[PDB]
Amino acid sequence: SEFVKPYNNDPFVGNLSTPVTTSTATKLYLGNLPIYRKGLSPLLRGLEIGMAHGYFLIGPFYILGPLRNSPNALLVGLFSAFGLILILTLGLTIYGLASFQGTEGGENLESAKGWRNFTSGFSIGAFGGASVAYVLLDNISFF
Amino acid sequence: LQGMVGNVDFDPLGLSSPNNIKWMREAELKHGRMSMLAWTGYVAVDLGLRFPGARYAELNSFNAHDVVAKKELFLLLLWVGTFETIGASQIYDMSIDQSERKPGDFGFDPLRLLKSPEAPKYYEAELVHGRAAMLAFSAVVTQS
Amino acid sequence: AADYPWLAKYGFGPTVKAERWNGRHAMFGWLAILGTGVAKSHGWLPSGDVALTYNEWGGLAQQGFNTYITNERAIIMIAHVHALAVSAAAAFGPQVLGDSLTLLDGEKDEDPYTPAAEMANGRMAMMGIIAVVLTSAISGKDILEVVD
Amino acid sequence: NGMVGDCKPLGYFDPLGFSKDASPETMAKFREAELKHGRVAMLACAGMITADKFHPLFGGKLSSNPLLAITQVPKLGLLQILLFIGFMEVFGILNSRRPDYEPGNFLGTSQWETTPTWDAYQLRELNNGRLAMFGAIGMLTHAYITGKGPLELLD
Amino acid sequence: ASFLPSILTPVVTLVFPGLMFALFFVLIEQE
Amino acid sequence: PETGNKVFDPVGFATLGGDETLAFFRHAEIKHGRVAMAAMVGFLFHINHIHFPGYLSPTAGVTFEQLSAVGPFEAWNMIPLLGQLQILWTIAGLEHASECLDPAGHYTKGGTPGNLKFLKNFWDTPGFTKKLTEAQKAEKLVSELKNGRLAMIGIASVCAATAVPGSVPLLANAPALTGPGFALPFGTF
Numbered sequence: 001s002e003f004v005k006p007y008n009n010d011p012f013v014g015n016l017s018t019p020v021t022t023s024t025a026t027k028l029y030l031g032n033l034p035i036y037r038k039g040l041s042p043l044l045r046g047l048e049i050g051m052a053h054g055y056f057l058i059g060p061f062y063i064l065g066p067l068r069n070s071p072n073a074l075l076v077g078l079f080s081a082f083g084l085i086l087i088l089t090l091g092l093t094i095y096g097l098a099s100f101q102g103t104e105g106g107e108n109l110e111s112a113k114g115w116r117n118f119t120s121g122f123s124i125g126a127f128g129g130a131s132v133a134y135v136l137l138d139n140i141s142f143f
Numbered sequence: 144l145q146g147m148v149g150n151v152d153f154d155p156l157g158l159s160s161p162n163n164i165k166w167m168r169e170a171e172l173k174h175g176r177m178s179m180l181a182w183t184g185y186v187a188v189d190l191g192l193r194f195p196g197a198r199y200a201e202l203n204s205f206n207a208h209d210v211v212a213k214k215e216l217f218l219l220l221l222w223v224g225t226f227e228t229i230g231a232s233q234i235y236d237m238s239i240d241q242s243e244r245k246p247g248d249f250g251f252d253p254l255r256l257l258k259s260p261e262a263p264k265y266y267e268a269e270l271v272h273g274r275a276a277m278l279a280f281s282a283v284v285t286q287s
Numbered sequence: 288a289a290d291y292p293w294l295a296k297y298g299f300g301p302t303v304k305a306e307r308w309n310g311r312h313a314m315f316g317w318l319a320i321l322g323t324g325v326a327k328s329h330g331w332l333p334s335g336d337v338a339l340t341y342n343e344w345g346g347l348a349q350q351g352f353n354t355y356i357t358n359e360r361a362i363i364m365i366a367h368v369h370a371l372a373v374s375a376a377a378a379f380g381p382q383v384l385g386d387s388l389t390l391l392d393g394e395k396d397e398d399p400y401t402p403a404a405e406m407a408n409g410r411m412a413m414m415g416i417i418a419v420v421l422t423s424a425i426s427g428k429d430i431l432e433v434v435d
Numbered sequence: 436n437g438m439v440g441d442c443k444p445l446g447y448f449d450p451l452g453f454s455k456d457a458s459p460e461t462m463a464k465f466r467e468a469e470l471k472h473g474r475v476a477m478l479a480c481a482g483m484i485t486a487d488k489f490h491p492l493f494g495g496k497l498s499s500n501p502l503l504a505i506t507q508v509p510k511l512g513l514l515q516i517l518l519f520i521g522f523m524e525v526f527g528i529l530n531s532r533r534p535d536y537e538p539g540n541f542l543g544t545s546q547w548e549t550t551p552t553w554d555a556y557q558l559r560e561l562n563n564g565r566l567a568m569f570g571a572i573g574m575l576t577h578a579y580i581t582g583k584g585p586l587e588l589l590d
Numbered sequence: 591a592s593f594l595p596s597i598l599t600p601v602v603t604l605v606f607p608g609l610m611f612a613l614f615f616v617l618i619e620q621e
Numbered sequence: 622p623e624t625g626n627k628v629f630d631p632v633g634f635a636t637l638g639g640d641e642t643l644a645f646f647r648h649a650e651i652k653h654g655r656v657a658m659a660a661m662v663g664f665l666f667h668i669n670h671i672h673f674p675g676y677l678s679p680t681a682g683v684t685f686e687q688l689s690a691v692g693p694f695e696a697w698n699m700i701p702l703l704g705q706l707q708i709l710w711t712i713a714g715l716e717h718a719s720e721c722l723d724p725a726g727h728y729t730k731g732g733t734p735g736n737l738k739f740l741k742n743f744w745d746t747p748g749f750t751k752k753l754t755e756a757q758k759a760e761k762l763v764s765e766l767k768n769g770r771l772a773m774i775g776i777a778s779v780c781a782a783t784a785v786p787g788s789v790p791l792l793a794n795a796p797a798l799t800g801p802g803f804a805l806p807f808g809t810f
């Protein structure tokens with residue numbers, strides 16, 4: 001048998017159609033991720049990605065941060081998450097400015113308006129996710 | 144503005160007209176429904192409708208939040224937050240852009256009651272009762 | 288203005304949008320001075336001029352340096368940092384059918400001079416803030432005592 | 436027909452003829468259920484075998500009894516296991532919904548040039564799945580009867 | 591005063607140079 | 622017949638929606654009547670001290686004898702927590718399959734309200750209704766509706782008897798109906 005064939009029946013493209021690259025599991029999961037999901041607007045793509053990253057970003061600061069052994073450990077973790085998210089959304093905005101200089105199409109991540117909607121979604125979502133993880137970690141004794 | 148349910152045109156102060164209305168009518172529906180459930184729970188709890196349990200026996204609405212904040216109200220927070228998250232996914236995808244949706248129609252008509260001939264009756268009763276329950280709950284909370 | 292096309296594009300600079308936003312912030316700031324003044328008159332903030340410690344606020348405490356960072360200072364710091372967090376959320380996040388901090392590509396800055404009422408009140412509030420800060424500086428008195 | 440479940444000791448084993456006069460949809464459902472049971476039972480049998488004598492997690496002193504251990508596990512761990520399995524199952528459902536869909540192939544084997552070697556190894560998977568299906572039920576039954584794990588029961 | 595190190599050192603050595611790096615990157619990626 | 626061969630609805634609850642809503646209401650009526658009939662038979666089996674022999678839970682040491690002894694509704698609370706989980710889970714799967722596996726579609730949107738036979742041998746497992754025909758079966762379904770409504774009234778009667786003083790005649794004294802009036806799922810919660 002042969003589970004490694006040319007990518008899209010093109011032997012001269014620099015890729016291989018391995019199980020990892022071209023399996024139905026990989027295709028399903030990637031195509032269903034928000035950045036690839038069909039029908040999602042750029043705002044919702046950014047929103048889902050933002051909440052996703054903001055929920056987990058608080059944790060390293062909370063437990064491994066300098067004030068882990070302090071009564072305000074989770075507060076400092078949330079503030080650190082907000083700062084890191086501010087840096088990340090600044091990076092997103094400058095990336096959009098540098099890449100999609102001249103664009104008018106919109107409704108597309110590869111355009112200025114679409115990337116701006118995506119960045120707004122990411123920023124709000126990540127702030128909300130950091131706050132939500134703060135709220136859950138305050139009341140973790142519930143579970 | 145005009146062309147919506149309960150349009151008395153009661154708008155002396157300026158809030159929305161060529162804009163915002165997609166959000167404003169839907170927020171009025173959400174606030175109204177919240178008010179109906181809030182006032183109904185307040186009256187039921189004050190009347191005597193209670194969960195079966197030792198902790199719930201003594202609590203009476205106003206004195207109940209602080210004790211029921213951490214365990215059961217947190218589960219309520221989780222459920223409400225999930226439903227509001229899918230609601231936000233539907234909502235932000237409408238108002239910021241111009242995709243087609245109606246204000247407050249989350250598609251929650253599982254019994255197909257809007258197929259009744261008197262569907263404008265519901266699209267009127269909902270808003271009126273939300274407003275009335277809002278004015279009611281403002282009173283019941285500001286008495287105490 | 289013209290020499291700074293980049294900042295002029297998004298309203299950053301001597302622009303009507305910037306004046307509007309700064310007037311709104313000056314309004315909220317005068318409110319904040321009045322609110323924290325009545326808060327100090329009442330008992331909300333911790334008293335005693337208790338300095339922060341490394342065991343609670345770490346190197347941001349500056350326990351042994353100098354500069355007497357207090358628990359009331361830490362709490363108001365948390366409040367204003369939360370304001371700054373909501374700020375980044377509102378500015379960068381989706382404009383909830385309100386005002387964009389940035390001009391945006393399509394919009395052009397409103398014509399320079401209820402919205403006009405906001406701008407008049409904002410100019411008044413900025414003038415009040417500057418006058419209070421000056422009066423404190425010349426007199427040597429505290430800002431809260433000056434407004435009191 | 437068209438599947439690879441047949442083997443030597445029993446041939447094409449269908450005494451009650453469920454597949455007889457049945458649709459390809461029902462046949463695919465049967466094979467998906469078969470492979471899912473086999474795989475879950477492999478995981479179960481391996482878990483009991485290893486955790487009976489080597490269970491470092493959770494303080495290193497959780498009960499070696501399979502039935503007692505899951506009750507001893509915290510609620511959050513069970514919730515996380517359920518979430519993980521559900522997240523695999525939504526992709527199972529989507530693979531079922533796909534236009535090209537063999538029953539248990541998350542790998543998408545149809546796009547590659549497969550051979551009797553691939554067929555034989557699919558048969559290996561299926562046979563091991565059948566054996567593990569019997570094994571897991573046996574292990575759980577012995578755990579309920581005697582209260583010992585698999586290897587302690589053998590001890 | 592002893593206020594000013596706290597006010598100025600982070601403003602001048604986190605915010606300003608980050609903004610300068612952003613501005614330089616955006617400028618060099620023009621046209 | 623007993624109601625006078627008419628719509629029976631004096632308040633207007635029938636046409637709050639449409640045909641889909643009426644189908645949902647009829648299916649809900651059928652399900653309620655079926656559970657009420659089963660509950661009535663279970664109540665009689667309990668209060669007559671009919672139960673299976675053995676230990677319900679040999680590990681926690683709770684028995685069918687204890688369940689029968691204490692009272693009808695209390696017995697549910699004395700079932701072990703995991704046993705109640707199992708009962709409600711097995712009902713959960715049946716309800717979900719009832720919602721889904723109808724080939725025609727939903728009872729509101731193509732299926733017959735109350736029809737559950739698409740789950741094979743769920744009904745008439747020994748096959749009493751196999752001999753019957755459609756004309757007899759419509760008559761029998763009318764009988765099912767009548768008995769379901771009547772058992773509904775009965776279970777509502779006995780619940781009020783066991784919760785609030787002597788509401789119902791002929792049970793307004795029976796010490797048979799004691800214990801709590803309304804069990805909760807999983808006991809306390």
Ligand code: CLA
Binds near residue numbers: 598
């Ligand atoms: C090149 C000279 C120089 C150097 C190396 C430093 C170094 C320092 N100053 Mg600064 N400072 C300077 C001149 C200088 N200062 C001058 C002339 C003044 C006005 C009188 C100040 C007033 C001042 C205050 C009030 C404070 C500091 C502080 C500090 C420390 C933190 C950095 C900071 O934010 O300061 C910069 C702060 C400013 C307000 C900007 C000053 C602008 C200078 C004059 C720019 C000179 C540029 C240089 C010649 C070439 C370009 C550099 C770069 C672009 C490549 C640091 C040790 C803080 C401290 O004490 O921390 C412990 C602090 O609170 N400085």
Ligand code: CLA
Binds near residue numbers: 468565
């Ligand atoms: C429940 C799991 C399960 C399922 C869904 C299937 C499904 C299938 N098997 Mg079977 N199979 C299983 C377990 C299962 N198998 C086990 C454990 C063995 C080992 C004895 C086999 C051995 C086997 C062989 C050798 C072959 C098949 C084949 C097939 C396929 C065609 C026959 C058919 O229609 O079966 C339909 C099966 C069902 C509808 C499942 C009915 C299960 C009943 C209700 C339970 C009976 C067991 C009893 C209650 C308890 C046993 C003792 C103990 C565990 C308590 C089909 C995909 C044939 C094939 O693939 O040909 C190409 C084939 O050749 N199977």
Ligand SMILES: CCCCCC(=O)OC\C(C=C=C1C(C)(C)C[C@H](OC(C)=O)C[C@@]1(C)O)=C/C=C/C(C)=C/C=C/C=C(C)/C=C/C=C(\C)C(=O)C[C@@]12O[C@]1(C)C[C@@H](O)CC2(C)C
Binds near residue numbers: 581680713
């Ligand atoms: C619920 C779990 C199983 C789910 C899997 C499953 O699918 O189940 C199917 C199912 C029924 C079902 C259906 C649905 C699936 C609902 C829907 C389907 O319809 C459709 C799809 O259309 C058909 C239908 C109606 O049939 C039900 C299965 C139920 C099952 C299998 C229930 C096991 C209990 C064991 C107990 C309580 C053990 C106690 C053990 C205890 C308390 C011990 O002490 C053990 C012990 O070791 C301890 C701890 C310590 C040691 O000293 C030794 C001892 C010995 C003392």
Ligand code: KC2
Binds near residue numbers: 512
């Ligand atoms: C199905 C497989 C599986 C996967 C793929 C998976 C993935 C991740 C990831 C992402 C990659 C993270 C970030 C994460 C984090 C944590 N997992 Mg987890 N996990 C799985 C299974 C279990 C089980 C069975 C348990 C468990 C636990 C914990 C705890 C400890 C909390 C604590 O200290 O109390 C934390 C923080 C234990 C627990 O919740 O204990 C109460 C527990 O029993 N996990 N887990």
Ligand SMILES: CC1=C(C#C/C(C)=C/C=C/C(C)=C/C=C/C=C(C)/C=C/C=C(C)/C=C/[C@@]23O[C@]2(C)C[C@@H](O)CC3(C)C)C(C)(C)C[C@H](O)C1
Binds near residue numbers: 320413
């Ligand atoms: C001389 C001259 C000119 C001129 C002129 C004139 C008349 C210029 C006048 C300028 C003037 C008078 C400019 C004041 C600005 C004040 C601001 C922005 C303050 C905001 C302050 C804010 C937003 C503070 C807010 C808060 O802190 C508060 C208060 C409370 C705290 O809890 C925290 C917060 C953040 C909430 C030209 C036109 C320039 C050129 C020409 O050739 C000649």
Ligand SMILES: CC1=C(C#C/C(C)=C/C=C/C(C)=C/C=C/C=C(C)/C=C/C=C(C)/C=C/[C@@]23O[C@]2(C)C[C@@H](O)CC3(C)C)C(C)(C)C[C@H](O)C1
Binds near residue numbers: 474478493520524527
């Ligand atoms: C049904 C189905 C499938 C399935 C499945 C099944 C059955 C999957 C099962 C998966 C399973 C069972 C996965 C467990 C993981 C456990 C982990 C990672 C434990 C972490 C443990 C951690 C992080 C910590 C443990 C601690 O104890 C430590 C060490 C110290 C103590 O102080 C306390 C704590 C808590 C901190 C297929 C086959 C996949 C596909 C098919 O199509 C459909």
Ligand SMILES: CC1=C(C#C/C(C)=C/C=C/C(C)=C/C=C/C=C(C)/C=C/C=C(C)/C=C/[C@@]23O[C@]2(C)C[C@@H](O)CC3(C)C)C(C)(C)C[C@H](O)C1
Binds near residue numbers: 631660697774
């Ligand atoms: C048709 C119509 C109308 C109507 C109507 C009316 C009056 C409707 C009434 C409906 C009513 C009254 C519905 C009751 C359901 C009761 C249930 C499901 C009880 C379950 C009870 C159970 C499952 C009990 C179980 C157990 O006890 C058992 C069996 C033995 C114990 O060991 C264990 C426990 C305790 C668990 C109007 C108003 C006239 C006009 C309108 O327009 C349309």
Ligand SMILES: CC1=C(C#C/C(C)=C/C=C/C(C)=C/C=C/C=C(C)/C=C/C=C(C)/C=C/[C@@]23O[C@]2(C)C[C@@H](O)CC3(C)C)C(C)(C)C[C@H](O)C1
Binds near residue numbers: 749774777792
């Ligand atoms: C409120 C009140 C009271 C009351 C009450 C009331 C009204 C109680 C009512 C209880 C009620 C009405 C209980 C029905 C059970 C019906 C069952 C189990 C039927 C099963 C029927 C079956 C299983 C039929 C099967 C088949 O026929 C099928 C379908 C077709 C054939 O092919 C095959 C066969 C033959 C097998 C008190 C307390 C008494 C007095 C007080 O004063 C007032």
Ligand SMILES: CC1=C(/C=C/C(C)=C/C=C/C(C)=C/C=C/C=C(C)/C=C/C=C(C)/C=C/C2=C(C)CCCC2(C)C)C(C)(C)CCC1
Binds near residue numbers: 051124127
């Ligand atoms: C695949 C896989 C994996 C991985 C996994 C992962 C990676 C996971 C993750 C997970 C996670 C990571 C999760 C998450 C969650 C989340 C959450 C829970 C969130 C929430 C949020 C919210 C709630 C928000 C809200 C808000 C606010 C607050 C404000 C406003 C806005 C908004 C609305 C947004 C593993 C390897 C393991 C295994 C195999 C498979």
